Amino acid sequence: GADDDKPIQVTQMPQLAQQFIKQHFSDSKVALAKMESDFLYKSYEVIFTNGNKVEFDKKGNWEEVDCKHTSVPVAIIPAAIQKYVTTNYPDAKVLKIERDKKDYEVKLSNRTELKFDLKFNLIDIDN
Amino acid sequence: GADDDKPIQVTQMPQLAQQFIKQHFSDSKVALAKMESDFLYKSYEVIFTNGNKVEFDKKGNWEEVDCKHTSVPVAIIPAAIQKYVTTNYPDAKVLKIERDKKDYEVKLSNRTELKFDLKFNLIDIDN
Ligand SMILES: [Ca+2]
Ligand SMILES: [Ca+2]
Ligand SMILES: [Ca+2]
Ligand SMILES: [Ca+2]
Ligand SMILES: [Ca+2]
C-alpha cells in the first residue's frame, strides 16, 4: 500500500528499467524513483520532473508509460497500434500506454481509450 | 471500430444486461444503447442521460461501469474492494469500476486508480 512506498535511487532499479529510461527518456530528468509494493506484488515507479511516469514490473519490464504531460515516445508503441491510432485518430497523441499478460490499453489526447489483445486485435473502444 | 456501432433498443440487449440496468440504474434514463464490435469482439454499451455508461460483454455481464458524473452504485463493488477504498480513501467515491478475466480496476474521485486481482488482492496503486 501507500505506506510501503520506498524511495530509491535509479541505480537500485532493475537494469532493464534503467536501460529503458536511458533509451526513451534521455531528455527528461528523474524527480523520484520508488519501489511500490503490497503483500502480493512489487513494482518500480519513476516520475520525471515534467510529471510523466513509468511503472515497471519486478523484472524491469515496463507496464505503464504515462506521458500525459507530453506524449508517449513512439518507439514504445507496437507498430500495429501506432498504425491504428494514426489512421483513425490522426489528430490525437498517445498520452498513456499500459500492458499486462493479456492486453494493451492506450489513452489518447482526445480522451478515447483503446484496448488491444496481445496480437494487436482491437477489443474495446471507449469514448 | 467506430464505424460498426449499431444503435439498438434496450430490449435487444442480453437479458442479464437488461436486468443489471433495472437493478442498479432504476433512477436513471437511457439516452442511447448500442452494440459495439470489431472483427474479434462484440459488446453492448448503454449511456444514461446524465452521461454515465455501462459496457457489457456479449453475454450481458458487466465489464465497465463508468459513473464519473455521480458514483458507482455500491452494490456492484466487491465487498473487499469497498472496504479497501472506504478504509484508505475515506473521502473518495468510486467513479468507475472495470473487470476482466484477470483483474478489477477502480478509479476514485481523487484520481487514484487501484487494481485488484480476482481474489481482491491489491496489485497496483497509481496516483
Ligand atoms: Ca467500449
Ligand atoms: Ca470499456
Ligand atoms: Ca486493464
Ligand atoms: Ca503503481
Ligand atoms: Ca500502474
What can you see in these coordinates?
The structure is a homodimer of 127-residue chains. Chain A is of the alpha+beta class and 127 residues long. Chain A has a single domain (1-127), classed as Inhibitor of vertebrate lysozyme, Ivy (3-Layer(aba) Sandwich). In chain A, 16% of the residues lie in helices and 40% in strands. Chain A contains two helices and nine strands. Chain A has helices at 15-24, 79-88; strands at 6-8, 30-38, 41-48, 53-56, 62-66, 94-99, 103-108, 113-117, 122-126. Chain A has a nine-stranded antiparallel beta sheet, with no helix packed on it. In chain A, strand 3 and strand 4 (53-56) form a beta hairpin. The longest helix of chain A has 10 residues, at 15-24. The N and C termini of chain A lie far apart (31 Å). One calcium ion sits between chains A (36, 43, 45, 55) and B (124-126). Chains A, B: InterPro entries: PepSY-like. Chains A, B: Ca(2+) 2 binds at residues 55, 64. Chains A, B: This is Periplasmic protein.
Indicate the CATH architecture of chain A: 3-Layer(aba) Sandwich
Q: Indicate the radius of gyration of chain A in whole angstroms.
A: 15 Å
Instruction: Please identify the top-level CATH class of chain A.
Output: Alpha Beta
Spell the H/E element sequence of chain A.
EHEEEEHEEEE
Compute the number of strand runs of chain A: 9
CATH topology of chain A: Inhibitor of vertebrate lysozyme, Ivy
Number of helices of chain A: 2
Distance between the termini of chain A: 31 Å
- Spatial strand order of the main sheet of chain A: 1-2-3-4-5-6-7-8-9
Largest sheet of chain A: 9 strands, antiparallel
Ligands bound here?
calcium ion
Strand proportion of chain A, as a percent range, falls in 35-45%
- Helix content range of chain A: 10-25%
The number of domains of chain A = 1
Tell me the overall shape of chain A: globular
